[PDB]
Structure formats: C-alpha cells, structure tokens
C-alpha cells in the first residue's frame, strides 16, 4: 500500500502569514483527445441479404 | 447451467458468446478504474494545510 | 483562442498556451502547462500602514515577504517593488500591518 | 430421455443468454453516463471548491 | 461465510460485485485534504503558491472583495460567523 | 436527386472509374438494369 | 504561416509542404486499417 | 490579446508568451526579461512530446 502525499504548509496564529513560492518553469505535459467524428457507412440491404 | 456436465456441453456449442459477455463486463470495469482514477488525480493536486 | 483563468478546462498546470490538429475521427489538442517544481515557504504579510492614507494592497499577488516590505510576483524570493504591485486600500487590523 | 432433455436445456440456455446480453447492454449505458457525471464532478470541484 | 452464518453472489448466480479500487480511508485522505487547501488555494494566487491563512480571513476576503461589501461593514460586524454556524448545523 | 433542377446524376462506387461502363453487359443490377464521365 | 514563426520558440506544428509534422506523426503511428480507400476495389 | 473577437493585433508569437506569462503565469515582466532560458524550456517540452 502507498498514498501521494500532498505538500504541507503550517498555519501561522500570528500576523503573518506563510507562503509557499514557486521557484521554476517545467513549461509542458501531454494532453487529452476529443474524438468529434465517427466513420460515415451505408448499407445495401437486399444484397446484404 | 447449474454444473450439470450436459448444460455444459450442449453450450460448448455455444461458447463464443461466453467469451463476448466477459470480455465486455471486463472492458467496462477498467474503464470505470481509469475513470476514478483520473478524478481523484485532478482532485487533490496541490499544498495544503495541517 | 484565449489562456483564460479557467480550472477544470484546459487540464495539467497553469495554462499558458494550447494548439490543435487534425486526427482520425476527431482533433488532437497540445495544452502546454506552467509547474512550480520547487517550493520554499516564506513569511509574508498583508500590506502596510506608514502613517495617514498609506495603506498598501499585497499586490496583484501576495508577494510581501520579510526583508524590505518588498514585495514578489508568483515565481522565485522577494525583489524590490515600487507600487508596481501595491495600489491602496483601507485599513485592516494589527495596525502597522493591513493584518 | 436424452431427446427431450436436450430441446428444453436449449430453451433454457438461450433464455439466459439473452438475458445476460441485455444486462450488458445496460451496464454498458450506465457506466458512459457515469463516466459524464464524473467529469461533471471534476468541473464542480475545481471551480466551486 | 456471511453466507454460511444464515448474498446471493455466492449463492447461486455467478456473479461478484467487485472492489471499489479504493479504500475509505484513502478516499477520506483526498477529501480530507481538499479541506484543508480550501482557505488557501482560492487567495488570489492562481494555484503555483499556497498562502497558508486562516479560515476565517478567507471567508472575509471572499464576502470583501467578490460580495460587494465594504471593508467597514465586515468589521464592524463579526459574529456573522453565528449565521454561517446556523447554515452548517441546519444541514 | 438535384430536386430543384430535377434531374439526376449515376455517381459510382469510390473506386469504380475503370471496370465500370455506361449501361455495361457486364453489371447485371438487381434492379430491373435500367440505370438512373468526370 | 512563416517558416521563422517563433523567436527563440520553436514549432513542428509548421507544414512540410498542409499535415504538420505532427499531425502526419500521429496518422502514420496509428494503426490505419483503411487504407482501401480510393482503390479498396 | 484580449479575448475580444473584434481586432487582430498580430504581435510575434514570443511576445504573446510573454503578455500570458505576465498576467496568468503572474510572472514579473521584470522576471521573465532576467532569464530568456524561458524559450529553451519551452523547446524541451516541445521536442518532448
């Protein structure tokens, strides 16, 4: 068994207050399909039976 | 059948449609994993507080 | 045709740009994302209070972090601010801060 | 007797068969329209939560 | 032995109800944890910081700024917590 | 059909310019083989 | 379309010469079972 | 530029990048002039899929 953990940040009682501060781009990902369209067919029944 | 050998055979005719019925049930039942599975990964995704 | 600040939309990441193509049956969509990657966590405060009407606003973002009252954008430590982030509103408690 | 047993095991075995066809087609139509729910679902939470 | 202890499942029809693929606890853990990003997440940060403030001053900052309510009316007036206590112990 | 103009044009099968020919011997349709080139 | 599009970016979406580079990437990876078209007889 | 349908500014299509990474990306403009490497990690996510 394992579970992800996501990051932890503590909450400040005082004033101020923390914050976590990104400090790269890693710009990217792969990504989803839509699927519009189906294929168009017709068929010739009396010569299909 | 109710594991009667005769029932059995006389569907060994028929086997193909066995196969057809769990292989669709089997397709549907991943589908709803990946299904859970990509919700619950665009769910938390994140930092969070104690 | 637009970024946007949407959320359960365009998937994975800030979104910053997206293209399409043509593929069987359908189109193929490229959302290019923005990911932190690496996180440090700061204190910060909410504004200021100088001495009459010199509330500051955190900015367009947080930012204020300790140092200089100088205030950050989403990426990387504090750099110098000049109201380039900080318009002004009215006070909030603990006064010296908009706390 | 072997000959009557057969057409009536017959019988029974295309009622059930059928049957299970039917339950299919209807789990099949249930899960697409969950699978529509659950991005629904992912939609609400992103933007209401 | 449930069913020995007298379900149908394996009783006489083939069939099996599968396992959901996650555990209640786990599933608590995501949810769990939504709740704790909530006051967070929605501080005007896009979502690459995290701004790990209080609950309530998330709910002023909401009702301040996305209400059209000014900063004076919300202080004057806390204990509007007592509605929103109302609200969640009514459901 | 060209409803409006009225009258009526034989396109063929995707991939029938060669073999096919106008009213040909060949074809016999289940069609009573009256029929209805780019 | 400009061959120079981006700056300092870079795009395969520009077409060879009209089906990008991806776009004809992701028609030639995928399994066509028809090719029968325009000569199927 | 601004989702508005009626005008065409036709800018280059760095300078696009960097009004998105400005506003949405809430990046400073200040920032993304410090390190141009921006248009490398781009190409690497690009060459990557």
Redesign the interface.
Same mark, same amino acid.
């Given at each position: 068994i394992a579970? &992800?953990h996501?990051?932890?940040?503590?909450? %400040?009682n005082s +004033? !101020?207050?923390? %914050? +976590?501060?990104? #400090? &790269?781009? +890693?710009?990217?990902? #792969? /990504?989803? !399909?839509?699927? #519009? #369209?189906? /294929?168009k067919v017709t068929v010739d029944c009396? /010569?299909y039976v | 059948c109710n594991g009667f050998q005769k029932c059995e055979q006389l569907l060994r005719e028929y086997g193909q449609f066995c196969s057809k019925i769990n292989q669709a049930l089997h397709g549907a039942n991943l589908r709803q994993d990946d299904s859970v599975r990509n919700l619950f990964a665009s769910v938390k995704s994140s930092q969070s507080s104690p | 045709k637009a970024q946007s600040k949407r959320s359960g939309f365009c998937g994975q990441g800030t979104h910053i740009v997206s293209f399409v193509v043509n593929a069987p049956n359908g189109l193929y969509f490229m959302h290019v994302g923005y990911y932190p990657s690496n996180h440090i966590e700061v204190v910060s405060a909410y504004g200021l209070c100088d001495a009459a009407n010199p509330t500051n606003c955190i900015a367009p973002v947080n930012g204020y972090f300790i140092k200089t009252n100088n205030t950050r954008i989403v990426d990387e430590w504090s750099y110098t601010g000049s109201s380039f982030y900080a318009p002004e509103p009215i006070t909030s408690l603990n006064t010296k801060y908009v706390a | 007797d072997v000959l009557e047993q057969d057409a009536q095991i017959d019988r029974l075995i295309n009622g059930r068969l059928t049957t299970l066809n039917a339950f299919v087609a209807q789990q099949l139509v249930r899960s697409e329209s969950a699978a529509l729910s659950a991005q629904l679902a992912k939609d609400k939470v992103n933007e209401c939560v | 032995d449930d069913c020995m202890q007298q379900i149908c499942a394996q009783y006489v029809a083939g069939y099996k109800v599968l396992p959901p693929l996650m555990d209640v606890n786990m599933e608590a853990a995501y949810t769990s944890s939504l709740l704790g990003s909530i006051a967070g997440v929605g501080w005007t940060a896009g979502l690459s910081s995290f701004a790990a403030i209080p609950f309530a001053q998330s709910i002023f900052y909401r009702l301040n700024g996305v209400g059209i309510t000014q900063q004076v009316l919300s202080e004057n007036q806390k204990l509007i917590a007592n509605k929103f206590n109302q609200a969640l112990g009514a459901m | 059909y060209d409803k409006e103009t009225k009258t009526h044009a034989t396109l063929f099968g995707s991939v029938a310019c060669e073999h096919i020919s106008s009213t040909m011997s060949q074809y016999s349709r289940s069609t009573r083989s009256m029929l209805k080139p780019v | 379309i400009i061959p120079g599009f981006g700056g300092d970016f870079n795009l395969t979406l520009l077409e060879p010469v009209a089906r990008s580079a991806i776009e004809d990437l992701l028609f030639d990876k995928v399994t066509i079972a028809d090719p029968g078209y325009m000569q199927g007889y």
């Amino acid at each position: 068994i394992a579970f &992800n953990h996501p990051i932890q940040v503590d909450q %400040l009682n005082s +004033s !101020y207050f923390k %914050l +976590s501060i990104p #400090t &790269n781009f +890693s710009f990217g990902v #792969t /990504q989803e !399909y839509i699927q #519009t #369209t189906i /294929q168009k067919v017709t068929v010739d029944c009396k /010569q299909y039976v | 059948c109710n594991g009667f050998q005769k029932c059995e055979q006389l569907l060994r005719e028929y086997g193909q449609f066995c196969s057809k019925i769990n292989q669709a049930l089997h397709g549907a039942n991943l589908r709803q994993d990946d299904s859970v599975r990509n919700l619950f990964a665009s769910v938390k995704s994140s930092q969070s507080s104690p | 045709k637009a970024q946007s600040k949407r959320s359960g939309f365009c998937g994975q990441g800030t979104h910053i740009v997206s293209f399409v193509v043509n593929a069987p049956n359908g189109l193929y969509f490229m959302h290019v994302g923005y990911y932190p990657s690496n996180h440090i966590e700061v204190v910060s405060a909410y504004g200021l209070c100088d001495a009459a009407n010199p509330t500051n606003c955190i900015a367009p973002v947080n930012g204020y972090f300790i140092k200089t009252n100088n205030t950050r954008i989403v990426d990387e430590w504090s750099y110098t601010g000049s109201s380039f982030y900080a318009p002004e509103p009215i006070t909030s408690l603990n006064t010296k801060y908009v706390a | 007797d072997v000959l009557e047993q057969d057409a009536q095991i017959d019988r029974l075995i295309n009622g059930r068969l059928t049957t299970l066809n039917a339950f299919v087609a209807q789990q099949l139509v249930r899960s697409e329209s969950a699978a529509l729910s659950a991005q629904l679902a992912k939609d609400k939470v992103n933007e209401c939560v | 032995d449930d069913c020995m202890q007298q379900i149908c499942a394996q009783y006489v029809a083939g069939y099996k109800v599968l396992p959901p693929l996650m555990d209640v606890n786990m599933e608590a853990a995501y949810t769990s944890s939504l709740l704790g990003s909530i006051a967070g997440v929605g501080w005007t940060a896009g979502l690459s910081s995290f701004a790990a403030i209080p609950f309530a001053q998330s709910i002023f900052y909401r009702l301040n700024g996305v209400g059209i309510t000014q900063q004076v009316l919300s202080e004057n007036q806390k204990l509007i917590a007592n509605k929103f206590n109302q609200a969640l112990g009514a459901m | 059909y060209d409803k409006e103009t009225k009258t009526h044009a034989t396109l063929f099968g995707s991939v029938a310019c060669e073999h096919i020919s106008s009213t040909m011997s060949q074809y016999s349709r289940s069609t009573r083989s009256m029929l209805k080139p780019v | 379309i400009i061959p120079g599009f981006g700056g300092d970016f870079n795009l395969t979406l520009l077409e060879p010469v009209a089906r990008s580079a991806i776009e004809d990437l992701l028609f030639d990876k995928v399994t066509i079972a028809d090719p029968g078209y325009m000569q199927g007889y």
